[PDB]
Amino acid sequence: KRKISKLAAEQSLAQQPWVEKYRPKNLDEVTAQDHAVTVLKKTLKSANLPHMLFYGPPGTGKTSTILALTKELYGPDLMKSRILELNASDERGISIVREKVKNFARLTVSKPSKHDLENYPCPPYKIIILDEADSMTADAQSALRRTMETYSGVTRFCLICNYVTRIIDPLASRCSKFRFKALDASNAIDRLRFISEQENVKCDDGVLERILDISAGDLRRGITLLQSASKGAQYLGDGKNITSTQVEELAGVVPHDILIEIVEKVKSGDFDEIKKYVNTFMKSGWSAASVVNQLHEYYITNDNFDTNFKNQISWLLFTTDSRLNNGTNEHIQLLNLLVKISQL
Amino acid sequence: KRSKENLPWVEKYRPETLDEVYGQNEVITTVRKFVDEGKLPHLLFYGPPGTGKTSTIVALAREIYGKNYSNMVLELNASDDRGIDVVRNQIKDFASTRQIFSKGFKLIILDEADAMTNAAQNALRRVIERYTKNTRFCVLANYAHKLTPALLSRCTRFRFQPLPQEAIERRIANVLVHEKLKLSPNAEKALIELSNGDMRRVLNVLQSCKATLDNPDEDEISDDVIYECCGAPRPSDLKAVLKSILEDDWGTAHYTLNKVRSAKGLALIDLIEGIVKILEDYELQNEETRVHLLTKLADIEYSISKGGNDQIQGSAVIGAIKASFENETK
Amino acid sequence: MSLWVDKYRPKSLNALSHNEELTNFLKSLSDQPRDLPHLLLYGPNGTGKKTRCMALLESIFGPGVYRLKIDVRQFVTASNRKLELNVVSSPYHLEITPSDMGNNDRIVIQELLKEVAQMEQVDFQDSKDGLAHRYKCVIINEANSLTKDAQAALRRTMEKYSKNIRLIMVCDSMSPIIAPIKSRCLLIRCPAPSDSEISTILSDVVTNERIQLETKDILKRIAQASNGNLRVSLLMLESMALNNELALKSSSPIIKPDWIIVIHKLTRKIVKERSVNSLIECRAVLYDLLAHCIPANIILKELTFSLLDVETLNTTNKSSIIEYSSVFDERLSLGNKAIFHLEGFIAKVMCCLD
Amino acid sequence: TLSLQLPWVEKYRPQVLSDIVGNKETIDRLQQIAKDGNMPHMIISGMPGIGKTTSVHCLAHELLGRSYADGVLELNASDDRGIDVVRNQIKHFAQKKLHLPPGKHKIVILDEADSMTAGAQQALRRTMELYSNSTRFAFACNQSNKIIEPLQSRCAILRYSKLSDEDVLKRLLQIIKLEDVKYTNDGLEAIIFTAEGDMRQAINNLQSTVAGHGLVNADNVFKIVDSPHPLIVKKMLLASNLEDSIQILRTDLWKKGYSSIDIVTTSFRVTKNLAQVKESVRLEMIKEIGLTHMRILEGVGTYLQLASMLAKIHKLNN
Amino acid sequence: ASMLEAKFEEASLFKRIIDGFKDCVQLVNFQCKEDGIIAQAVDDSRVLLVSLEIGVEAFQEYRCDHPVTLGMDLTSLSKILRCGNNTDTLTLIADNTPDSIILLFEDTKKDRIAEYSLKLMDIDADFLKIEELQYDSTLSLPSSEFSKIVRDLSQLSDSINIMITKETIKFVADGDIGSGSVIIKPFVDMEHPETSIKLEMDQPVDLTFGAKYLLDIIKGSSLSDRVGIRLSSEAPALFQFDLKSGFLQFFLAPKFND
DNA sequence: TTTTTTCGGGGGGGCCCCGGGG
DNA sequence: CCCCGGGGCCCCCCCGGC
Ligand SMILES: Nc1ncnc2c1ncn2[C@@H]1O[C@H](COP(=O)(O)OP(=O)(O)OP(O)(O)=S)[C@@H](O)[C@H]1O
Ligand SMILES: Nc1ncnc2c1ncn2[C@@H]1O[C@H](COP(=O)(O)OP(=O)(O)OP(O)(O)=S)[C@@H](O)[C@H]1O
Ligand SMILES: Nc1ncnc2c1ncn2[C@@H]1O[C@H](COP(=O)(O)OP(=O)(O)OP(O)(O)=S)[C@@H](O)[C@H]1O
Ligand SMILES: Nc1nc2c(ncn2[C@@H]2O[C@H](COP(=O)(O)OP(=O)(O)O)[C@@H](O)[C@H]2O)c(=O)[nH]1
Ligand SMILES: [Mg+2]
Ligand SMILES: [Mg+2]
Ligand SMILES: [Mg+2]
Hints:
This is part of a larger assembly, with chains A (about 350 residues), B (about 325 residues), C (about 350 residues), D (about 325 residues) and E (about 260 residues).
Chain A: H1 9-14, H2 18-21, H3 34-46, E1 52-55, H4 62-74, H5 79-82, E2 83-86, H6 94-106, H7 114-119, E3 126-130, H8 138-142, H9 145-150, E4 155-161, H10 169-174, E5 176-179, H11 189-198, H12 207-215, H13 219-236, H14 244-251, H15 256-268, H16 271-281, H17 288-300, H18 307-325, H19 330-342
Parallel strand pairs in A: 1-4, 1-5, 2-3, 3-4
Chain D: H1 8-11, H2 24-36, E1 42-45, H3 52-64, H4 68-71, E2 72-75, H5 83-95, E3 106-111, H6 118-130, E4 135-141, H7 149-154, E5 156-159, H8 165-179, H9 185-195, H10 199-213, H11 218-224, H12 229-237, H13 242-254, H14 260-272, H15 279-297, H16 303-317
Parallel strand pairs in D: 1-4, 1-5, 2-3, 3-4
Helix pairs in contact in D: 2-3, 5-6, 8-9, 9-10, 9-11, 10-11, 12-13, 12-14, 13-16, 14-15, 15-16
Chain E: E1 4-8, H1 11-21, E2 27-33, E3 36-42, E4 48-55, E5 61-64, E6 68-73, H2 74-81, E7 89-94, E8 100-107, E9 112-119, E10 137-142, H3 143-154, E11 159-165, E12 168-174, E13 179-184, E14 198-201, E15 205-210, H4 211-217, E16 226-231, E17 237-243, E18 246-252
Antiparallel strand pairs in E: 1-5, 1-7, 2-3, 2-6, 3-4, 4-18, 7-8, 8-9, 10-14, 10-16, 11-12, 11-15, 12-13, 16-17, 17-18
Bound molecules: phosphothiophosphoric acid-adenylate ester (3 copies), guanosine-5'-diphosphate (GDP) and magnesium ion (3 copies).
One magnesium ion binds near residues 53, 54 and 111 of chain B.
The structure holds a DNA duplex (22 and 18 nucleotides).
């Protein structure tokens, strides 16, 4: 084997996907979570960090925030010995919580080096990070209740989740709660523009705003969309600017003309015509969730429909979205929704 | 573990004596009377989270045994193994042997006993009955349905109510004095409202509010600080959203909801909960209105608990409220 | 020899003959593969998703991606249960179908994939740019069949070890995929080929195989009957050619699968007879269909759409049928015993028809 | 204070069969057996705190006299009762040679026998059959169904019923006279009502009330013993107007610190035992309660879910 | 290797000391100060208290600048100590604010160095003063005979009753299969002053103890050839094994007489 | 007139191998 | 130096509400 020399961390990161390449490295790179980032920064000097429960929708900056906080607190050298990270990729049964987590929590804090004490605050406790904590069973969660309180003097717990309701009430009570807000064009445009400028991506006016609107609160999705658009523009090699239409095509948004055709077919009210059109439409591979979202946007915001129609269609759309969230056949659900709307 | 000032406020302010437990005057008085005259029975403490059960039992242990209580009581919780073998060996040995240090009776505290298996609970029955002359048991629970009837028959039950307002105010005053903090009356009202009778929530939110101030020495905590740190809707926002839903057209209501949410990045669940609380006080002529409101809002809450599309859920809330209130006309 | 569906499968991006825009997008992706993110290709079945994935891999690495071997991996559960996993591997990529382990698929994600993720590549695989390849590709087939726990386990594995591995997932629908996974992947829509493109492919196969054709209308009819499924169209063409001595006539009928015929018979029986005895016989037919590896969801979809094509039913009956189909498809998604839900759907349809 | 007052349930534990109140026929049969002898294999089943263990121990004591220490083997759930124990220790005790009065036998008291495994019960069959000439077996349990049929066939079934309010009042008055307890009729009535036929609960509540307040009246008794929440739930489910049911839920249950899971489980049980309502209506209410219970188990334990459940029940009852 | 440096000339002595009570307790706090090492632990059932003391005469060299507390899991410590040969000196090393303890096995003749590190644990235990009590009876007997008696009686019952009367010590056990009683009397032999049984009685005593705890306690017989038992009504029984410089003590609570 | 899925707990059979005795 | 007793894992089998 020829073998390959080890690759430096800087160049390794430079060749990573944009989502990982531009992950926040310190608490100042988190864009729109000041209501919690300010408190976490104040803990750097207060040195009384409480048990934390970060909860929020996908791609809002929870894992990035906890990693940045741990780094700022301990330093590159002392971080490894002061952190115990367990996620959904590891076994986290009641036995694990009772034995391994408890043993780590009971341990004495690793001694900081002289350099670490000169540079980093080095608080007198370690941190256990239970990422994707909503996947843990109720009994395993209950096994943590007294472990958290007994060893608070040397250990602090951080639980991260998307659905706060899956955390048992005692644990939520024990933890200080931090809700991570959805990232939209009004609070995350600066970070996306910075990323675009750093990558010399040329986009028309409003393209980044359109990407953020399509992402629907997920900045990771927006960054991935921007990277895909940049790759397409580079491959084309024409020097032209990225357009909103290209972003919509990359994001799987149904073209407006197809939506108008669907709306007219629904207005017609003929069952067979709607069925045939939907059969043809599902061959394009459009995601049913996107179609339902676009239909909701078209109908709720239209001024040509009365209050009763909107009241009924809102419930119809809610029911269809709930059924789709369970992993159901898209064709059947979309046909049922369209027929029910047509009968309104 | 350098000093007590490096601890979270929830643990830093844990009561040390029964005199520091607030909002449970009946239970505290009764247990103190039992202890004073040596008439302590087997105890069960049933209550919701963060009401003072563990604190109360630890304070009672200190009252009975003193500063060295930890070596004179057998404390087991969910973080420990409490299987049938443990009951047969460790608890049985502790209950049937004299104290090493003193000559008093022996206390066993089974915290979070609702997490114990049925077999262990059944095994505990004859242990409790046989060694009553020299041993007492204290059980702590949040859910009574997990306790076997045989165990319940053998214990005297005390219910820890959700903390009243006055106890929370007095504890907040103590914390403010200790921390050198200023709290506005409206801020205190909002903190008590959001606490829902849990002291841990009050303490965590107060610590976050202190961390949110630029200069805690002179800056005061206002309702705005509370709402910002907790990221919760203000009463004005809830009132405006409800008024728009109940008095405006669909377009205006949708725009108002979106603008209110986007102004401070509010969560739809908080808006739904606040609107439900507001509507609970409405005097409705027709019961069908209330029935539909409750059912549809519960469905929306359950759907939100599993994720989904936020915009569709908000439109569903608007439509459900409008449709339900359409029945009040006739 | 090999079936015409397999013998003429394209082996490169430049060999693709339909959905040119998707080909251009894939070529753009493969231009600078060093920073390629995780990919999730979603589209209708039998469209060419796996073919395009293999073509993209060939473009990134080279022809060697098609030198495939099969190995067997051992797994042990908490109950000391020995499980076998068939892994399709290449010098540049691995292929896994964790759904083969059912509820144990999590283990495959927790141990196998992680083991590959933690292992850095030390093979000097010189690329076009002149620098050796850095990551190893892993394909997860039928990703929509993964349990929620396995998908949750995939999250930090994807995030932490992106420098060592890149995931390519293929699915018919994204509805069963959890939001965190979709957020972590670049989503690629794979539209079904048009009728003209299917006819062109079929005519190319016909001329390569020297098959007598009376007219080009037979290929159009085959494409129409396939409903945009290219694999089905090719297999149907081969079956028709075999059944007619390699000489297709304008009157040659379209050959349908046995299970399709059984479902059509069941639909006719349901429409004709609506009683409890008919329900018992329908249960027998459903048991027969399920015993021979006919998925419950496929049965429900085919039954619903066959019923909706009946000409005697009116608008109200069809609306009720589609509503019940939606409800019971959700029930199947959230259930274990499929026969229960299928019988409930048939009973509701029988009640509605009367 | 390091002193402990002996509980009255132990200080006044019956020592002879004559001091056991309730189940007159069964106690009379036990007394006749004790006077005569030839005790058969027996299984005693009943609800908690009615005098099963007391009856068995009194019977054994009066039957064996001074030979109680040598001729009685007592095993309960707190002891090890596995297959090895049954096969070795119990068998050895059965085979043990011990001279006894003309009509007495060694007694094995397996208390709380319903917790024994199937294997141990199977192993007991031949031990019981082979050594019946010198050993007899007494089982005490709460659920007789848990005892395997082969063992039930070899035993005499003596089922105990809940004690009537009269027996509870008699025993409470005896204990009060012995202890010189100040009381009022309303206090005793409240104690009996809250006990629900459980003598141990009644005695414990009386002792706790005397210790906490001295005077045993209605006010002090309710201050010690809380109102049974099942009755509150039953009132909630049978309310005429949905507003009244919601008010009960918000004031008597939710604000008193009762968890949603407890409320939903109690609602399920009460609806199951609501003979006043038609069975089909009860089944519909049970379906709705199950939906709400599943939602709570998924983690949505909010008051809104309970309010929605009450609204749906009200719609069903309309 | 600055604050605490304590060298056992024989590495087997520390292993024996740890093995004497490793089956009784798991988490132990060792307090090291200028005059030596002390340790106190309470069993999980809180029925047995173990107290170890080692003076500075037991070390070839010993240096401690300030008092240091080391919380250790005895299972891990025993595992580490099992990796040392009997011909190697054993140095215990600890620094300021320590998170670990270093055990260094040296074989100068073979020039072999074996260094191990054991992570410390945070144990919130305050040394509880074992107040001296004027016991009613105090006896001393060879450890081997006591171990044999305890092992023989443990086969019959889970409880052993010790009765101290004028000129007599009686150990009784009663169980399912039968009973046993061993009676000994104070005996002195000047020829061999190691098999002698000594007794000093002020008030006769009768105390019952769990057999498992006595079985655990007798494991200290490998440290001393004699064991001293101090018994007094209304007080824990003290079992002491004397080392060259220090001792190992077990305080065992009697069973309630009811 | 016959015969299925999962954790966690508990039980019970089967070795394995250290220690101690001869 | 070799055999025997008995602690400790390892593996598998069955329950689960009132
Ligand atoms: N607040 C943010 N500021 C800057 N970048 C962000 C932010 N949130 C997300 N991102 C970007 O998206 C990527 C993923 O962010 P994450 O911290 O992993 O989100 P997440 O909330 O942990 O996702 P989940 O809950 O596991 S689905 C980061 O590397 C960033 O590049
Ligand atoms: N009555 C109270 N008075 C003062 N502080 C209280 C009180 N109750 C709870 N707290 C505060 O909240 C913290 C936790 O109290 P706990 O006694 O642990 O409540 P708990 O009921 O035992 O919680 P669970 O049942 O384990 S979820 C205490 O350290 C106090 O700081
Ligand atoms: N019939 C009774 N007469 C007098 N006292 C009784 C009677 N029943 C119960 N008690 C009293 O309550 C105490 C407990 O009675 P038990 O005999 O233990 O009830 P039990 O049937 O064994 O309960 P379970 O099934 O083991 S939970 C006795 O010591 C008595 O003091
Ligand atoms: N001539 C031609 N055949 C294709 C093309 N794409 C797919 N196919 C054929 O269609 C068959 C099925 O495609 P497949 O990759 O299995 O679709 P999937 O089920 O969505 O992954 C393949 O065996 C190919 O032979 C194409 O672009 N050109
Ligand atoms: Mg994350
Ligand atoms: Mg507690
Ligand atoms: Mg009993």
